[PDB]
Amino acid sequence: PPSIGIAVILVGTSDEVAIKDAHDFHHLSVVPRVELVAMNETDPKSIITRICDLMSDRKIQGVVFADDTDQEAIAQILDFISAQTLTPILGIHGGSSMIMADKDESSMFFQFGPSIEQQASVMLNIMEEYDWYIFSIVTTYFPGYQDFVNKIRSTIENSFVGWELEEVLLLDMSLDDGDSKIQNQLKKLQSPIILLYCTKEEATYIFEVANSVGLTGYGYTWIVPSLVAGDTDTVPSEFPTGLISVSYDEWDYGLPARVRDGIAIITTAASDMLSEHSFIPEPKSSCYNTHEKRIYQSNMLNRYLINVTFEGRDLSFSEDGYQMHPKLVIILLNKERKWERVGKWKDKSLQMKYYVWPRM
Amino acid sequence: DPKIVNIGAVLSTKKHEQIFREAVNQANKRHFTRKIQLQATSVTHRPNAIQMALSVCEDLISSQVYAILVSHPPAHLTPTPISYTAGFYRIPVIGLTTRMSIYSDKSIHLSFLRTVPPYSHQALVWFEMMRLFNWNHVILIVSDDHEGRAAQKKLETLLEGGPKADKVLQFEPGTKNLTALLLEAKELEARVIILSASEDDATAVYKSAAMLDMTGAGYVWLVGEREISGSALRYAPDGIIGLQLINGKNESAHISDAVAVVAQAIHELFEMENITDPPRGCVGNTNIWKTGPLFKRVLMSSKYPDGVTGRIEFNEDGDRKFAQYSIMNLQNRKLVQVGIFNGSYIIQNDRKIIWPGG
Ligand SMILES: *[C@@H]1O[C@H](CO)[C@@H](O[C@@H]2O[C@H](CO)[C@@H](O[C@@H]3O[C@H](CO[C@H]4O[C@H](CO)[C@@H](O)[C@H](O)[C@@H]4O)[C@@H](O)[C@H](O[C@H]4O[C@H](CO)[C@@H](O)[C@H](O)[C@@H]4O)[C@@H]3O)[C@H](O)[C@H]2NC(C)=O)[C@H](O)[C@H]1NC(C)=O
Ligand SMILES: CCCCN(CCc1ccc(Cl)c(Cl)c1)C[C@@H](O)COc1ccc(NS(C)(=O)=O)cc1
Ligand SMILES: *[C@@H]1O[C@H](CO)[C@@H](O)[C@H](O)[C@H]1NC(C)=O
Ligand SMILES: *[C@@H]1O[C@H](CO)[C@@H](O)[C@H](O)[C@H]1NC(C)=O
Ligand SMILES: *[C@@H]1O[C@H](CO)[C@@H](O)[C@H](O)[C@H]1NC(C)=O
Ligand SMILES: [Cl-]
Ligand SMILES: [Cl-]
Ligand SMILES: [Cl-]
Ligand SMILES: [Cl-]
Ligand SMILES: [Cl-]
Ligand SMILES: [Cl-]
Ligand code: NA
């Protein structure tokens, strides 16, 4: 079988050996020729020039990307690169996997981890478990915030449960806060539960302000999505103990297993397309000639990328570019400032550790 | 020796680069620049998005630009890659001639002002016309894309915040033959029709409206600029009224006004304490420019009254306010200016309006 090039890009320390181990158990129509690449930087230029150099020095059919940062921008950079070059990119760990709402129309970028809408519903399930029916929402303008608010609103307005959405705050973190605008907005909060949609960096500032006006102590419980907790080994000091987060940052699904599944997805999808059309998309020889060769390129390979099953496991992606059925882990920031497993979301069912929340 | 503060620009031609240089030179002559002195750094548009993004890093951000002017090239090449790369660091981008409404979305373009208004703001002019000519019942037809919906939202805000829209009709972009949609409009009693659509989509509407005899006497057609441009103008019904943003395509004029605004904002910025420098280059830098958000606020609230393109202010989306429009009326298949929106007021000239039919 012919070989297709797959670049696996790793940012930050990682056991390359352990990663090469979890991986040629392919008897498909095509076999992967993978290439581990180390990267030290995660700025726009570094990421672009690196992937472009790979694409020009070799024939890359797809990219598997993983980083150890809390930088959600990385996902947005990858989507741009993916759409422009029409190359499949899987963000499987780190900032690369942090929700990227409204991917490009031509994007072939897929992320491991929950969609925004799924996290929103997981949160409502948590609140239902403990009969926390009265709450407010705080988001920034971070892309996806509308999907988050809409999802919540759609769910609670279509249920006979006595949900009471008191307030929805929209914080503008693109301007400075010298006029104490965000402080004045937060002072409006009264709910005992607060859902916060934003980035990790934004959360640390918002919590600092929220603390100053006494909204983080006892009586107030904040619930944030995966990307706010991000790397759970890095816990900002402004984060309030008692913070609850839906998470997917490498609890039961290790990096090695992810890299192996990433390679599988890309390889299977190419095999499936080859077996049906007798051709696969030719690897782009460069990024610097995409404007010419666009009538000759297409995101055709997407329809196969989203429907792969491997070793009897459904690795399907949504058309929005998210994982379909991720086993989510509910985590709590405890007294020792450590993130702590306190529930699991599996088979569209919530299984919490505690019946009554112990004191944090 | 003063502190040199670089201003960036991505412009159409070398001629415009030189205009940008001279504009910055004049700002330095005009202002007190013992402490702070501007320096111009510019390139022209690269052939594709990725190259453009890289150039922003290599040519501009490497010079520690505090802001970046961007023109819309007239030749598929948008300011978007520049908005993205600059936005990564919270370095403000000033659009010179981009009209698409999507650049008003803070989620996508989180440090983007422009000295021209988005197409959607043409609703402001429509509204004043509805007051003036007392069109208290209108039918709104818009393309079911971002731009079409943007115009609908803006007009509905004005109407809900007097005249009323008796109905709103959305059609799928790229639909030739819109008989079904237009028949629905025909039934209604209102006969003032407002259209937001691309060139090609407006053409389809116009043709279909003609076959349904909805372009004759009794009807009023009020549209924007795209809708009386190119091929849309070729099939537009006589008597139609449209708009043309004055100086809307004059890159030179907007470079002048943008530089003046940015220079004024920079001198105002350095009146405050604890101003940090933007990152030098992209490589190895992933943190935002800490002073970026402050500088954005300063720009947002900038006022430049004696601008080449008129009074310069920005709204809460960083879009141009007090924009000036030519009110055009197709008479005998010739576009004729029948007045202007001077930024806040409609001014009818001595040329008489000829409506559809009459
Ligand atoms: C777009 O077009 C509009 C309307 O033409 C302009 O707005 C007008 O701007 C002019 C200035 O050129 C203003 O004229 C001044 O009006 C003052 C009184 O205003 C009151 O009354 C008027 C009429 O009812 C109202 O519209 C207004 O809201 C106020 O209630 C006068 O006191 C001024 O006279 C003073 O200055 C003159 C110098 O010219 C002296 O000789 C006098 O002694 C006196 O000191 C002057 O006449 C006018 O008020 C504005 N109208 C409105 C509606 O705002 C915009 O300027 C124009 N935009 C652009 C970009 O050109
Ligand atoms: C769709 C692409 C967006 C790009 N992004 C900048 C990051 C990025 C993305 C792609 C590229 Cl190629 C590059 Cl180089 C840099 C801009 C925007 O996504 C910023 O994301 C947020 C938007 C709003 C908020 N909150 S706010 C407005 O209150 O401050 C926070 C982040
Ligand atoms: C990253 O840094 C390490 C040592 O710090 C170096 O060996 C390696 O070559 C660097 N990677 C790149 C792509 O420069
Ligand atoms: C564009 O504006 C400039 C002023 O900067 C002016 O000199 C020139 O005449 C204008 N061009 C057109 C076509 O209006
Ligand atoms: C900024 O303020 C700090 C005080 O925390 C001071 O040390 C520093 O000198 C100031 N710098 C400027 C340029 O204002
Ligand atoms: Cl590197
Ligand atoms: Cl893109
Ligand atoms: Cl996430
Ligand atoms: Cl972050
Ligand atoms: Cl650089
Ligand atoms: Cl007139
Ligand atoms: Na803006």
Evaluate whether B38 touches B27 at the Cβ level (below 8 Å): yes
Quote the CA–CA distance of A203 and A207 in Å, as a whole number.
6
Instruction: Choose among A229, A236, A206, A265: nearest CA to A94.
Output: A229
Domain shared by B182 and B221, yes or no: yes
Evaluate whether B192 touches B185 at the Cβ level (below 8 Å): no
- Rg (C-alpha) for chain B, rounded Å, is 22
Determine whether the interchain pair B50/A290 forms a contact, defined as Cβ–Cβ distance below 8 Å.
yes
Q: How far is the alpha carbon of A161 from chain B, nearest alpha carbon, in Å?
A: 32
Domain shared by B142 and B244, yes or no: yes
Size of interface A-B (CB pairs under 8 A): 88
Contacts of B49 in chain A (CB under 8 A): 80, 84, 290
Quote the CA–CA distance of B342 and B310 in Å, as a whole number.
9
Tokens 């109905």, residue? B167
- Rg (C-alpha) for chain A, rounded Å, is 21
User: B10 has which bridge partners?
Assistant: B43, B70
Instruction: Choose among A198, A230, A226: nearest CA to A68.
Output: A230
Quote the CA–CA distance of A167 and A149 in Å, as a whole number.
11
The number of angstroms, rounded, from the C-alpha of A182 to the middle of its chain's C-alpha atoms is: 27
Which method resolved this structure? X-ray
- Tokens of residue B257, six digits: 């006004």
3-state secondary structure of A128: helix
Q: What are phi and psi of B57, to 5 degrees?
A: -75, -45
Instruction: Choose among B62, B245, B160, B195: nearest CA to A44.
Output: B62
Q: Order of strands across the sheet with B320-321? A: B304-307, B310-314, B320-321
Domain shared by B232 and B305, yes or no: no
Quote the CA–CA distance of B300 and B315 in Å, as a whole number.
7
| Start-end of H helices in chain A | 16-21, 44-57, 73-85, 116-129, 145-156, 181-186, 200-212, 226-229, 255-277, 302-305
Determine whether the interchain pair A288/B50 forms a contact, defined as Cβ–Cβ distance below 8 Å.
yes
Q: What angle do CA A177, A179, A184 make, to 5 degrees?
A: 85
Which H or E run includes B341? strand B334-341
Domain shared by B192 and B98, yes or no: no
- Tokens of residue A232, six digits: 């759970």
Domain shared by B230 and B333, yes or no: yes
A250 carries a ligand binding annotation? yes
Contacts with A16 (C-beta within 8 Å, 6 or more apart), sequence order = A10, A36, A38
Quote the CA–CA distance of A226 and A241 in Å, as a whole number.
16
Q: Which atom of ligand 3 is nearest to the CA of A39?
A: 13
Q: What are phi and psi of A339, to 5 degrees?
A: -75, 135
> CA-CA distances (angstroms) from residue B160 to B156, B165, B275, B316?
6, 10, 43, 19
Domain boundaries, chain A: 1-113+248-326, 114-247+327-360
Contacts of A291 in chain B (CB under 8 A): 47-48, 76
- Tokens of residue B336, six digits: 């004729």
Domain that holds residue B348: 118-251+324-358
Topology match between the domains A1-113+248-326 and A114-247+327-360: yes
Longest CA–CA separation in chain A, Å: 65
Contacts with B15 (C-beta within 8 Å, 6 or more apart), sequence order = none
**Nearest C-alpha to atom 13 of ligand 5 is from which residue?**
B274
Quote the CA–CA distance of A235 and B246 in Å, as a whole number.
53
Tokens 């930024």, residue? B343
Q: How far is the alpha carbon of B303 from chain A, nearest alpha carbon, in Å?
A: 18
**Of 3.30.300.30, 3.40.50.2300, 3.40.50.300, 3.30.565.10, which CATH number belongs to A1-113+248-326?**
3.40.50.2300
What is the number of the ligand closest to the CA of B275?
5
Evaluate whether A229 touches A30 at the Cβ level (below 8 Å): no
Domain shared by B200 and B297, yes or no: no
Q: Distance, CA B42 to ligand 10 centroid (Å)?
A: 15
Quote the CA–CA distance of A105 and A321 in Å, as a whole number.
11
Instruction: Choose among B86, B60, B57, B55: nearest CA to B8.
Output: B60
Q: What angle do CA A184, A189, A193 make, to 5 degrees?
A: 145
Quote the CA–CA distance of B151 and B118 in Å, as a whole number.
9
Domain shared by B158 and B229, yes or no: yes
Longest CA–CA separation in chain B, Å: 73
A93 carries a ligand binding annotation? yes
Instruction: Choose among A123, A138, A121: nearest CA to A207.
Output: A138
DSSP string, A36-60: EEEE---SHHHHHHHHHHHHHHS-E
Amino acid in position B28: N
Quote the CA–CA distance of A40 and A46 in Å, as a whole number.
9
Among B50, B82, B317, the strongest candidate for a mutation testing the A interface, having the largest count of A CBs within 10 A, is B50
- Tokens of residue B38, six digits: 């501007």
Quote the CA–CA distance of A1 and A29 in Å, as a whole number.
6
**What is the CATH number for B312?**
3.40.50.2300
Domain shared by B185 and B98, yes or no: no
Domain shared by B184 and B328, yes or no: yes
3-state secondary structure of A325: coil
Which H or E run includes B336? strand B334-341
Write out residues with Cβ below 6 Å of ligand 4.
B 250, 252-253, 256, 308
Neighbours of A334 (CB within 10 A): 15
Q: Which residues of A touch B (CB under 8 A)?
A: 41-46, 48-49, 52, 69, 71, 73, 76-77, 80-81, 84-85, 102, 141-143, 145-146, 172-176, 178, 287-291
Which three-class secondary structure string do you get for B127-180?
Answer: HHHHHHCCCCEEEEEEECCHHHHHHHHHHHHHHHCCCEEEEEEEECCCCCCCHH
Which H or E run includes B301? none
Domain shared by B122 and B112, yes or no: no
DSSP string, B58-82: IIIGGGTEEEEEE--------SHHH
- Tokens of residue A163, six digits: 């949900």
Q: B85 touching A, CB under 8 A?
A: yes
| CA within 13 Å, CB half, B1 | 3
Quote the CA–CA distance of B69 and A86 in Å, as a whole number.
29
Ligand 10 (ion): which residues have CB within 5 A? A 45; B 57, 281-283
**Of 3.40.50.2300, 3.30.565.10, 3.90.1300.10, 3.40.50.11440, which CATH number belongs to A114-247+327-360?**
3.40.50.2300
Q: B47 touching A, CB under 8 A?
A: yes
Handedness of CA A263, A267, A270, A272 (dihedral sign): negative
Instruction: Write the burial class of residue A169 (CB in 10 Å: 0-12 exposed, 13-18 middle, 19+ buried).
Output: middle
Q: Which of A44, A85, A142 has the CB atom closest to B88's CB atom?
A: A44
Tokens 């395509």, residue? B249
Instruction: Choose among B350, B355, B352, B347: nearest CA to B132.
Output: B347
Helix, strand, coil percentages in chain B from 3-state DSSP, rounded to 5: 35, 25, 40
- Tokens of residue A315, six digits: 């690795």
B273 lines ligand 5 (CB under 6 A): yes
Counted domains in chain B = 2
Q: Distance, CA B278 to ligand 3 centroid (Å)?
A: 26
Contacts with A60 (C-beta within 8 Å, 6 or more apart), sequence order = A5, A6, A7, A54, A87, A283, A284
Q: Which of B76, B107, B286 has the CB atom closest to A143's CB atom?
A: B107
**Nearest C-alpha to atom 13 of ligand 4 is from which residue?**
B250
- Tokens of residue B251, six digits: 């890159």
Domain shared by B172 and B201, yes or no: yes
Domain shared by B157 and B213, yes or no: yes
DSSP string, B195-252: EE--HHHHHHHHHHHHHTT-SSTT-EEEE-SGGGSHHHHHHPPTT-EEEEETTTT-HH
- Tokens of residue A158, six digits: 């279509």
